[PDB]
């Protein structure tokens, strides 16, 4: 159990609050919303990549490279 200097610096981040949790649900409800949000985001991207969704003036193909 060497008491190095860097260990002194980092031990608080390592295991100061090890094994601690808040009871109940806590922030879990909020997390739910975030997941749903990204579940739309990714979905939209997929369809945009899939050409299911066609955004206005956004030609999902090699033609969009025009301008470089």
């Amino acid at each position: 159990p060497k008491q190095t200097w860097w260990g002194d610096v980092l031990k608080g981040n390592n295991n100061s609050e090890a094994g601690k949790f808040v009871p109940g649900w806590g922030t879990t409800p909020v997390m739910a919303g975030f997941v749903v949000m990204i579940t739309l985001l990714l979905l939209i991207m997929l369809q945009v990549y899939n050409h299911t969704i066609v955004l206005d003036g956004v030609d999902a193909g090699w033609t969009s490279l025009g301008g470089f």
Binding site: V22, P23, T27, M45, V58, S64
Partner: protein, 63 residues
């Protein structure tokens, strides 16, 4: 970078920058929260956050 919707065109490189900026910030916030916030008993017991094997499982799925 441009935040107009045509940055979601996968073939236009202006999206990539626009991604790595915004997503980058999103991770920083996401970092800060997790550097401070504790888990929840419910999730902590469900996912067994005390056991590194759960981190392995989730990381392998992500990869």
């Amino acid at each position: 970078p441009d935040w107009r919707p045509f940055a979601f065109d996968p073939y236009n490189p202006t999206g990539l920058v626009t991604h790595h900026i915004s997503a980058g910030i999103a991770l920083i916030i996401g970092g800060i929260f997790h550097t401070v916030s504790r888990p929840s008993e419910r999730l902590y017991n469900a996912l067994s956050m005390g056991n590194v094997e759960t981190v392995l499982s989730s990381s392998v799925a992500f990869v």
